Design a protein around this ligand. Structure first.
Ligand SMILES: CC(C)(O)Cn1c(NC(=O)c2cc(F)cc(-c3cccnc3)c2)nc2ccccc21
Length: 291
């Protein structure tokens, strides 16, 4: 493996200012805040993530390790960490919150252009993790954040690894045998897409997670969302193949979704599409990538 020359920056508690709480409870306490580097006329909006136990501090730092090691437009940036009694991860602020909440809150204002663009950006983001040899192991709409309606990024690398669990997003080989590859993340990409195309429905709603393993063994999959054409739904079903090597790679998903994003009303049928605003088989070179 190659040496990891990432800088982990250590920030002073004095350098930043907490303004209000965005999220709370189990996964942590996420605060809205502003960061002002010591000797620069610059104010950077940020999200700060904080009881102190030895086990808790290992896992929060392992997240910090990975987040510091990534640089992509569609992957979350760790700015630094502050070593107070409880450790704080200073990260880039994502004003519109998680995408799952965003789609549900704006069901009636999300056009097909946006949906397919998010599919490309997520696929792009995941493909970078594949390039960096990282498996995410928890891809969903709750762990994709919205910088702007035109710009989303992947997050939550507490479950990420090199080369309570969400059974309803996991591939079969992961559920049965604990085997996670990049192609097991493709399964979860498929579900994530399905969440967006259903405008934030719960996958396998009113089905307990212990039944899922046997359900998928029998051949059953998530149903085709109403807005989805057969073209888009086919791509989801390809992500949910029993054979993992049969599923598509993220580089190919980027291609297919970018293809569709050129002519969005052909591949998605939304009521009153492209009268709504928010705050030739051709692929542009930048969406054609080699590993
Ligand atoms: C629950 C959630 C995500 O909606 C909180 N939230 C956020 N989140 C972040 O800014 C944020 C940014 C990151 F770079 C990483 C994580 C992050 C998330 C999970 C685990 N680890 C790290 C969270 N922005 C908001 C704006 C409005 C309302 C709620 C908001």
């Amino acid at each position: 493996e190659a040496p990891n020359q990432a800088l982990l920056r250590i920030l002073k508690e004095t350098e930043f200012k907490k303004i209000k709480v965005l999220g709370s409870g189990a996964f942590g306490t996420v605060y809205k805040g502003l960061w002002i580097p010591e000797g620069e006329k610059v104010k950077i909006p940020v999200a700060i993530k904080e009881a102190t136990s030895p086990k808790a501090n290992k896992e929060i730092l392992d997240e910090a390790y990975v987040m510091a090691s990534v640089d992509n437009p569609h992957v979350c940036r760790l700015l630094g960490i502050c070593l107070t009694s409880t450790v704080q991860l200073i990260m880039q602020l994502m004003p519109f919150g998680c995408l799952l909440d965003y789609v549900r809150e704006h069901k009636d204002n999300i056009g097909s252009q946006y949906l397919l663009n998010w599919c490309v950006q997520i696929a792009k983001g995941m493909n970078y993790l594949e390039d960096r040899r990282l498996v995410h192991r928890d891809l969903a709409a709750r762990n994709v954040l919205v910088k702007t309606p035109q710009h989303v990024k992947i997050t939550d690398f507490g479950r990420a690894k090199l080369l309570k669990v969400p059974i309803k997003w996991m591939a079969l080989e992961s559920i049965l045998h604990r085997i996670y590859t990049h192609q097991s993340d493709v399964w979860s990409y498929g579900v994530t897409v399905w969440e967006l195309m259903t405008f934030g429905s719960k996958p396998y709603d009113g089905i307990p997670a212990s039944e899922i393993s046997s359900i998928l063994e029998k051949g059953e999959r998530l149903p085709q969302p109403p807005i989805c054409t057969i073209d888009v739904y086919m791509i989801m079903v390809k992500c949910w193949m029993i054979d993992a090597d049969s599923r598509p790679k993220f580089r190919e998903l980027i291609i297919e979704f970018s293809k569709m994003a050129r002519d969005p009303q052909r591949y998605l049928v939304i009521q009153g599409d492209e009268r709504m605003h928010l705050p030739d088989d051709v692929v542009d070179a930048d969406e054609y990538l080699i590993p």
